[PDB]
Amino acid sequence: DLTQLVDSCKSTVVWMLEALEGLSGQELTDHMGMTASYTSNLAYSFYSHKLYAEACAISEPLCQHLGLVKPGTYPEVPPEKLHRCFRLQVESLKKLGKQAQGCKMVILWLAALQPCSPEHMAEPVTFWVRVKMDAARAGDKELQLKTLRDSLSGWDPETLALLLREELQAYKAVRADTGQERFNIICDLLELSPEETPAGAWARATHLVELAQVLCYHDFTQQTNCSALDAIREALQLLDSVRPEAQARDQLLDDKAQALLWLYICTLEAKMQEGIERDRRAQEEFEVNDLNYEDKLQEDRFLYSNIAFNLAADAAQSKCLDQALALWKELLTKGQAPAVRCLQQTAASLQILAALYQLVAKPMQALEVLLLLRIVSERLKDHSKAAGSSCHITQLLLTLGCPSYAQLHLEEAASSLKHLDQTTDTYLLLSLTCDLLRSQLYWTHQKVTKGVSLLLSVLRDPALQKSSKAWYLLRVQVLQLVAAYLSLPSNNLSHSLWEQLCAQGWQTPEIALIDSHKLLRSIILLLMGSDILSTQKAAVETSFLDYGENLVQKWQVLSEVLSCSEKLVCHLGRLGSVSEAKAFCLEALKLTTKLQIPRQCALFLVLKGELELARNDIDLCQSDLQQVLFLLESCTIPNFLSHSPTCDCSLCASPVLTAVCLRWVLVTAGVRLAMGHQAQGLDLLQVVLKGCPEAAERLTQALQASLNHKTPPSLVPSLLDEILAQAYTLLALEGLNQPSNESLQKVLQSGLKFVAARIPHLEPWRASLLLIWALTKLGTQLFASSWGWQPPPGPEIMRSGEWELLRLDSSTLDSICDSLSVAFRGISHCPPSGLYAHLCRFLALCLGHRDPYATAFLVTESVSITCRHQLLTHLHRQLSKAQKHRDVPLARIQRLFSFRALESGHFPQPEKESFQERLALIPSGVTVCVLALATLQPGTVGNTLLLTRLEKDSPPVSVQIPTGQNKLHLRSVLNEFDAIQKAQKENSSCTDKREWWTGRLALDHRMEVLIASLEKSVLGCWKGLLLPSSEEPGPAQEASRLQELLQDCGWKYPDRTLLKIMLSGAGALTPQDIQALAYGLCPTQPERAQELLNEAVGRLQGLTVPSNSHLVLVLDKDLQKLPWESMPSLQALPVTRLPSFRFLLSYSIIKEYGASPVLSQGVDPRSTFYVLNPHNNLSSTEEQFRANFSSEAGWRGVVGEVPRPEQVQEALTKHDLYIYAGHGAGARFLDGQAVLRLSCRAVALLFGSSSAALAVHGNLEGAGIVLKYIMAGCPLFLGNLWDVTDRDIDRYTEALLQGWLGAGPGAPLLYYVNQARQAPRLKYLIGAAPIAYGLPVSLR
Ligand SMILES: [Zn+2]
């Protein structure tokens, strides 16, 4: 058909070919050129029609003419035309899928292009590599053996070298493993270069560095018998002894520069290999109480390799990099165009150097490299590379805190982006990046409304989820931007935009940051494997595949991993989650030890020293700080103190390492301020006040010289502002303890101007300074007028990351209240644990009974905040897993615990609306009592107690008890309790019966006096608020009559409910209780009020019956130690304690969706797992319980052996009862993290020492394994508050088990808990110890 017609045309074309034949002269060549262009037109049609055969007919004549052209020399009759025509023929051979004749035919293409300058032979080699690759892809090894040298074998040896160089460069662009092919070419290249001619020494040197790149990532030493380091040092020796010509001095540079750069990389890789080898070869009777199990599990295999750093090689290493920058600076900054061979390899190498500088934390010199990269891209006219470099510059400048210089480079990227094609992936990726940069620029310049709009559109772009390593890195930066918006106060953004942001999936900033950290570790695993950081062998070793972009991405990912850890550690430390932060700090320290970077190590040691200070561990804090000094002093009262603001020392020229030094003085002052050395900590803190503005000035001065802008960058950058704010906080805190010194007073105002000028970035520090303002103005008291009540035997034994798989690259009072309102709204979205409690309780005192509902919400909001943060992080992991597998109960729990689930308005209207909804959810028959103490001075224990009683269909009731007036202060009770605990440890050492028993008996009497002191001295008459109410209509009527009469007696705030609760317990109202109540409530006429109360109490007496109900206690960090359950009044009621008020409502949500079989149905006695005597040192315990436990029906367990973790998981998830008799809470068998990941269904009866005890370290909140059990859904948890001896605690276990189990179906556990307290001989030292966490349970 058309092909047959083409055959006829080919016949005419053959006649035309014959016509061109014989014809001689440029005119004949012109006629031949016309025929060639016609053949090109015919080939265009044939190619379009895939008529390879028809094109091949013309190609056959053309190939013959190509062979004829090879005979002798022919002028460039068809420049590019010949290449394009031959390209069609090669494409036709590719269309024929036959590559055997393709490679010989590219030879004819090479033969046709023979007498030309090196730029001309650049296209055939790309095809030559390409026809090689697809044939190699199928597996044609024979064609792989064919390279240019043997194929040609007929060329000028010098020109053959340049052809071989082009093949090597083309092989780097191939996105597959090409180590062996590249190695073959280099060996042929080395053979050609003579070893005696001075010009041959140059060629030998250039070829040697290519071998170093191949050997650095491939083990080919079995063939070349030379290591990477020896070859690279051999190259430098040859380069040193060269005296070049003036024309080629440009090429001497970029050869010496590339050699020095690759000296650094291959010596760095050797150090990393050595570290992994050292690591791989490299790989406790406190059981009485495991409260510190995690602390010991952090290990001590540190602080040794840290001193193995800072050897003189580190500076010697940095000398190589700095000299390479100097040489490349000379070559490029000159006006004249460069004369190098491949400017692309110069551009590619510069990107690797730029990335390495950021890894070693030298960002200023990384900015110089990126400026030169843009210079190369402008000459190369590659618009994609110019935009990429400009985006990196803007990202770098923002981190340094310079929003002014960031904008110009952001706009330069936009202009260069237009020249690109709008359909490629590069355009889409770069457009999204610039919008992300613009969104961050809006956030820094206080334009949040438009910034949120841009970010939302970026998050809603369908292309962001494309599977590639470049997209994964953009996703990481998107998540870090989300945390920036999630850190803002509520007033910045409207309710509509807040809902849209939280609907994406991230609630709190730490959740977003943790998700970013997970993604980065996934990229590392997808790139280099996990041996670099995971420390454990993953039973597989992946390749690295250095194809150019993989090499630069390798160093970029590592830098961002360290950068992410810094933000995560600082933010988690500020909230109060010290334990979680130390895990991130230690993992980052391990990475920096393997890379051997002293600069990054010093920064992370400083942060760890800050964390240890918050836990009141001075010895470890002092150990860390001295390690910093050795690293700092060898790298460059410390010597760096008192430095002029022009110092060019290695520690006086870099902003990163100046911040490390500034934090050192702050942490050093904190240690001295806690050790009693005032006037030295104050003097130290003055230096940080002086230093920070000076440091910013030098960085501002230096940034100008680097970028060569004209004006100073408008406002001074903002990177040391956080340090200056914390320094200003500490100084004002010591002003309270020394109010005599008027000098510290101006600091409080001087600090406030600094913080108020940078709203809304230093908002947490603004809140702290406002709180000190309230306390300074503050100094019963002035809070009295807001409240309605004014005060009138043988010694016994004492018992890290989750990687994810990624797809292939394929009046004074009013002023104080108004001031605190501003501070509360600045931190409520993400409250720190310490500050929030102080603010809420202080505000609650001032509001008093002027607003009962706001008072109840404030007191409720101030307890167990760190648990609330950890629960929200836990829920995100739960919901994310469900989405991975493929949730209504989880969604409602998130809204219950969220911080931003509020409407708009003035304080406190939205909170009262949200609080009223929560009250309506309270189950019937439950009384919720909150006990917390108000601390006026932060850092000390207060003497004022707050009590709130919450019930269904009843307004909240609150009351204040000041204990400083009477003897037996609340601090005295707390001090006495700790004195008993210390004497218990000392008495255990004695080894005689008489002194042991006599001492133990005395301790029991002291505990009895303390418990009775709680009821009489502390609670007084207000113990009635803890007892339940009554259902008879008697009390309500009497309160109705008494309310009017009591108002005329002088009661400021008459409340109907308070009298009703107190009149219900009229049976136990002692006559002394009446006097305390009557005098406080009615100061005007105390005698008259006594008459009415006595008249009313007498009538109600005998006519009251107690009801069946439940009491739940919520206690703060200090009051949770004391045994409230063992008070004389509460020895007849079921009492449990919960972490917070919201936890009670969480059980109701879970209970309705059928997720708690124990609460819904009951406990089946035939589902029990016991762990008895695991460590085999409690013989008397075993013989008292072995026989009883074994004979029971359906009971399984482990005796005398350590259980496996798999056994314990089945017990908690599938069995109903878990009994542990041994040392501690069994944290070793099941740690805290393992408990959190499972759904706990069983009831935990852990009879170990200090199992249900929360450790209070410093001002941080309590921690323990009991919180993990409650957060996993445990119905009830039973444990001990202090240490107990085995023989007595065995009696308690016996009484509780025999009584409860033998009681029959339908028996409540709490009733028999109180019964068993009488079994032990020491009824107040051992009997009071067991407590219950959770909700009451029963048998089926
Ligand atoms: Zn200096």
PDB file of N, CA and C and ligand atoms in Angstrom, residues 643 647-649 652, ligand 1:
ATOM      1  N   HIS A 643      34.393  38.403  75.615  1.00  0.00           N
ATOM      2  CA  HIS A 643      34.909  38.528  74.259  1.00  0.00           C
ATOM      3  C   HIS A 643      34.337  39.785  73.619  1.00  0.00           C
ATOM      4  N   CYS A 647      35.300  39.413  67.755  1.00  0.00           N
ATOM      5  CA  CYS A 647      36.152  38.234  67.835  1.00  0.00           C
ATOM      6  C   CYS A 647      35.898  37.294  66.665  1.00  0.00           C
ATOM      7  N   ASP A 648      36.982  36.853  66.029  1.00  0.00           N
ATOM      8  CA  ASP A 648      36.915  35.952  64.889  1.00  0.00           C
ATOM      9  C   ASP A 648      37.327  34.531  65.250  1.00  0.00           C
ATOM     10  N   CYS A 649      37.235  34.165  66.526  1.00  0.00           N
ATOM     11  CA  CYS A 649      37.536  32.803  66.934  1.00  0.00           C
ATOM     12  C   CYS A 649      36.541  31.838  66.304  1.00  0.00           C
ATOM     13  N   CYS A 652      33.586  32.199  67.879  1.00  0.00           N
ATOM     14  CA  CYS A 652      33.103  33.572  67.889  1.00  0.00           C
ATOM     15  C   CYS A 652      32.675  34.054  66.511  1.00  0.00           C
TER      16      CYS A 652
HETATM   17 ZN    ZN B   1      36.568  35.800  70.049  1.00  0.00          ZN
END
